[PDB]
Amino acid sequence: YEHTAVMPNKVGIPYKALVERPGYAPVHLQIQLVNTRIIPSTNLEYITCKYKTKVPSPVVKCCGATQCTSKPHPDYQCQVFSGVYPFMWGGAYCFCDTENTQMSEAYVERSEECSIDHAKAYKVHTGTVQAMVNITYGSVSWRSADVYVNGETPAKIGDAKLIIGPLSSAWSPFDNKVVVYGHEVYNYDFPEYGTGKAGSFGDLQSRTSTSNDLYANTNLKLQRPQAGIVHTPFTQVPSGFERWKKDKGAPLNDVAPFGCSIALEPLRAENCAVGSIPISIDIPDAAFTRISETPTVSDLECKITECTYAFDFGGIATVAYKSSKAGNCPIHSPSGVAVIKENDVTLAESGSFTFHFSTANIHPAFKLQVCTSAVTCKGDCKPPKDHIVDYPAQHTESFTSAISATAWSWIKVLVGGTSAFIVLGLIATAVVALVLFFHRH
Amino acid sequence: YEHTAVMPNKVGIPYKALVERPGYAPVHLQIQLVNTRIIPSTNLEYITC
Known part of the structure; x- marks a missing residue:
């Protein structure tokens, strides 16, 4: 038997449902997400x-001049300085006074730390969504298997075939271009x-981690050596990657909404809570029993002893039954006012059992079914003493879940008696037309 | 759990109260002054x- 319904996109909260098959006792189906x-x-x-700009040794022409060729190198620079007359250790180096030439050639390469810390520039294109579902039904235990979240793929877990439907929203935390630095990712634009x-971010761009090609502009400029010493002095703007590491915003794993944890190695976005996930699970008939197998119940009376407003399981009710024989049939509340902590129950010959629920209403009005037999429960609830807790809400909050009975009666005379007061004013007009028409004849 | 009330300023007369934690059984409480x-x-x- 197929069972098709919808589910909120939540991780911790399970999805409890009852499968209604004609001629068979209903079974309990629970769906829980993990990731x-x-x-x-x-x-x-x-x-x-x-970057790291290495300087080769210069040639010192003693009496003459030289030129240079445009060698293929990233940010390669060249100049020729005349009349240098350098001094080394042990006297002068050349003889021609004020007629000389020094080379001073410079060239930019990437650092030896580039294999350890680097920022990788990615372009994000929309891909696939997958998750992990926990399966149990009837008396079969909990078991889990990975599924694919689309509209086509059938996933066989246990004995049942489950098709996880597509997400109700295509919202993704990633931008078009993301940059990955170490452990965290960022939403940053590229120089492409x-x-x-x-000096900003792309002053050294290499197409892969070991590419022979390398694009690098760094405003390198060669200066004149001074006062008769041999060195090659240069001048360039500082590193843009180093400047990016200080003037840097918050990462995407501290900014992304809906509680999206962000992992790295396939670059996923774990445990977001957005939209809804439809299902279609084909439960086998080997877990289905006949009507004659299950025991019918009768004379149901449910009383809520204590209720609390908090989203822990803070509602306890006792209900007394009268069953035909002993057995085990599941209980379930189909309405959204209350969720039920336990699934099955230990029946006897006219006993009484207690179940724990968690609502968000001042006055709950839900009903629950036991062995395909319904019973209505009602009561009153008190606010909780706590202000802040460390666990999410088990229930769901509706529009009319906050209205007490006193305020519901107060709006029942401000729109009930007032709208009925214009009924009195309208029929006085309708009879003054009749009493004036009768004056003529 | 915290329980606040007002007791009178009598020495030998004990003050009895029943604290009510939600979800739990009530616990009897007895405060008595000596001096x-x-x-x-x-x-x-x-x-x-």
Whole structure:
């Protein structure tokens, strides 16, 4: 038997339902989620790290001049300085006074720390969604298996085939372009490998972690060596990756709404709570019993001894039955006013059992069924003493769940008697037309 | 759990109350005084004999 219904996209809260099959006793079906992963499809554009400009040794022409060729190198710079006349250890180096040439060639490469700390630039394209569901029905125990959240894939868990329906919203926390640095991800824009502003983020872009190609602008500029010493001095703007690591916002795993935990190695977005998930589970008939197998119950009276407003299970009710024989049949509340903590019960010959519930109403008006026989429960509830707790809400909050009986009666005379007061005023007009018409004849 | 009330200022008469924690059984409570001493602050000025 198939069972198709809808489910809120929650992790901790189970989904309790009863399957109504004609000619068979109803069975208890419980669905619980464990994880909920949103996995986009990403492609790496480039990586970024701090640079390191190595300077080769210069040639010191003693009497003459040289030139240089445009060597293929990232941010390669060249100049020629004349009349240097350098001094080394042990006297001067050249002989021609005020007629010399120093090379001073510089070149930019990536650092040796680039294999450890780097930022990877990704482009996010919408991908797949998968989750993990816990399955139990009847007397079969809890078991779990991974499913795929789409509209097509059948997942066989246990003996039943479950199709998890698609999400009701395509909301994803990721932007078009994300950057991954170490443990956390960010929503940051890129210079897109063609640009780089020499001090901001893309002053060293390499297409992969070991690429021979390397784009790097760093505003490198060679300066003149001074006073007769041999060195190559340069001048460049500082690192844009180093500047990014200080002037940096909050990561996406501290900013993302709906409680989206963000993991790394397939770049998922775990345990978001948005939308609804439809289901379709084909329960086998081997877990179904006939009407003659189950014991019928009668003479049901339910009394709520104590109720509390909090979203712990703070409502206790005792109900006395009169069954035909001993047995075990599940209980369930179909309405959304109350959820029920236990599923089955130990029946006897005209006993009484207690069940724990958790509502969000001042006056609950739910009903529950035991061995396909209904009984209505009602009572009053008190507010809880606590202000802040560490566990989420087991129930659900409706529009009319906060209205007490005194305030419900107060609005029943401000729209009940007042709207009926215009009925008195309208019929006085309707009879003054009749009493004036009768004056003529 | 915290329970607040008002007891009278009598010595031998015990105060009885029933605390009501929700979800739990009530617990009897009994507070009784033994002494009640008012101690003013004094400073000696002189003695006489």
